[PDB]
Design a binder for this molecule. Structure first.
Ligand SMILES: Nc1ccn([C@@H]2O[C@H](COP(=O)(O)OP(=O)(O)OP(=O)(O)O)[C@@H](O)[C@H]2O)c(=O)n1
Ligand SMILES: [Mg+2]
Length: 437
RNA sequence: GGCCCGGGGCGGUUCGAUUCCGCCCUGGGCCAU
């Protein structure tokens, strides 16, 4: 019931059990055998190699080290070739250079092509750094293996564990470095409560300092920011979880919260109680990977939100959801409808030249003077958020993401109310409005 | 692909645009393992 006791029970959630590790063992077993009966230089890395993987999150990563001279094409060609034979069920996967993911003796496995180097420099792509990481980190993270796990599980249970764009949280490598720096999961949590958006952590120098933005400098590359893809909001969300956990320890922070299934009528009653305008932009999901998709769903979500605010609808927040089939850009505005007339500022009264010009534009209402300057009554081309967004999406599709923008351009519709609550957006909507339960 | 910094063109809107909404070529960097 107290801090340490809680952590104890918590280990039984992050650390694996024999069966799973054994399975990981025999897995790594064949994988080498096959890899050897080909004879290709390979390095085992990642959480598996270092015994820092999360219970029920087994995944063996293997980096194929090629010479400096080789062609990146050789890297992927020769890389994929290898992945093929060595893997039970391969699958081409994409991101940096491409790579292959499959299964062996029952476990997930990654095979990534990268250039084997001497000295962190000569460094080409992010993968060429991985190998150094495992090196620097292997002689240090021992014995604390579980402090790392407790951390991941923590971040995980609370939705901020990934480093990819669909998370923008903490990479697994970031975690390890922290455990090395603070020495324990408890120590990190305690200290993170004082972290700021301007905190710099230099593990290589055992130092912490003030910088421009949150920065955890890489042991292996003083210039990289291990935590570079960690959104500020998530950073903050963590800092807070830490204060909270400390004030009241709980096993709960180590258990994923359940999706909270709410019935469409309760949602409808909430939206009505809010008297707000809640609607969604739906369009066929592009067929690109998540690291390409999400950043675009973000941009589009943002660009529309902005149109909404300069257009005076008063958006409150925005959200977005992606299913196998389509996408959804959610918005909730304070203005359901707005007047058609609005005022547009004009020149100062003494400026004759411009006054003339301003008054020559014939409009339906005849302008007036207020505090030494002219103003005119203009009419809006639309009066509801949905109305205006249909106009914007339809004519500004190109700026919502190379891919997202093109899907919308070929089709999109605006869903609202009775029909909206049916779409698979309930959870995102509840979340977006802070609905609680 | 997204993001940050810089050029060269244009369009729309506006009394007035380098200054808003956008589009084209283009230089630099960062992220995602
Ligand atoms: N944003 C990232 C992602 C990955 N890596 C490198 O890739 C390794 C992580 O690979 P991944 O399989 O994505 O995660 P793991 O570290 O193995 O941990 P977990 O599998 O539990 O996610 C890190 O150790 C690091 O060398 C990195 O440096 N930065
Ligand atoms: Mg892994």
């Amino acid at each position: 019931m107290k801090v340490e006791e809680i952590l104890e029970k918590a280990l039984e959630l992050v650390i694996p059990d024999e069966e799973e590790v054994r399975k990981g063992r025999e897995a790594e077993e064949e994988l080498r055998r096959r890899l050897d009966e080909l004879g290709v230089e390979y390095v085992f890395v990642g959480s598996y190699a270092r015994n820092t993987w999360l219970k029920g999150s087994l995944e063996i990563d293997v980096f194929l080290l090629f010479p400096e001279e080789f062609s990146k094409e050789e890297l992927r060609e020769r890389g994929l070739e290898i992945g093929k034979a060595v893997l039970d069920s391969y699958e081409i996967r994409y991101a940096e250079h491409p790579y292959v993911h499959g299964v062996v003796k029952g476990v997930e496995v990654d095979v990534v092509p990268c250039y084997k180097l001497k000295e962190p420099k000569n460094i080409k792509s992010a993968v060429d750094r991985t190998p150094f990481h495992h090196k620097w980190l292997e002689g240090r993270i021992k014995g604390k293996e579980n402090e790392v796990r407790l951390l991941k599980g923590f971040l995980k249970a609370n939705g901020i564990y990934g480093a990819e764009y669909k998370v923008r949280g903490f990479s697994g490598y970031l975690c390890e470095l922290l455990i090395v720096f603070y020495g324990s999961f408890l120590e990190t949590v305690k200290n993170a409560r004082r972290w700021t958006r301007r905190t710099v952590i230099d593990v290589a120098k055992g130092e912490v300092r003030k910088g421009e933005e949150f920065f955890v400098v890489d042991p292996v590359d003083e210039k990289r920011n291990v935590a570079a893809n960690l959104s500020l909001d998530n950073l903050a969300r963590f800092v807070h979880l830490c204060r909270e956990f400390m004030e009241a320890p709980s096993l709960g922070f180590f258990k994923p919260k359940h999706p909270l299934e709410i019935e469409p009528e309760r949602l409808r009653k909430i939206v009505e109680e809010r008297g707000t305008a809640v609607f969604a932009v739906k369009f066929r999901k592009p067929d690109i990977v998540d690291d390409n998709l999400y950043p675009q769903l973000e941009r589009a979500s943002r660009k529309i939100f902005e149109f909404l605010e300069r257009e005076n609808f008063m958006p409150l927040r925005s959200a977005f959801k992606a299913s196998e089939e389509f996408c959804y850009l959610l918005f909730e505005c304070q203005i359901k409808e707005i007047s058609r007339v609005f005022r547009r500022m004009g020149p100062q009264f003494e400026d004759e030249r411009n006054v003339k010009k301003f008054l020559s534009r014939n409009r339906a209402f005849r302008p007036f003077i207020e505090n030494g300057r002219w103003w005119a009554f203009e009419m809006r081309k639309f009066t509801t958020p949905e109305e205006g967004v249909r106009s914007y999406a339809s004519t500004h599709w190109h700026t919502l993401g190379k891919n997202v923008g093109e899907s919308i351009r070929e089709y999109f519709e605006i869903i609202s109310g009775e029909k909206l609550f049916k779409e698979p957006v309930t959870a995102e909507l509840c979340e977006m409005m802070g609905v609680k339960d």
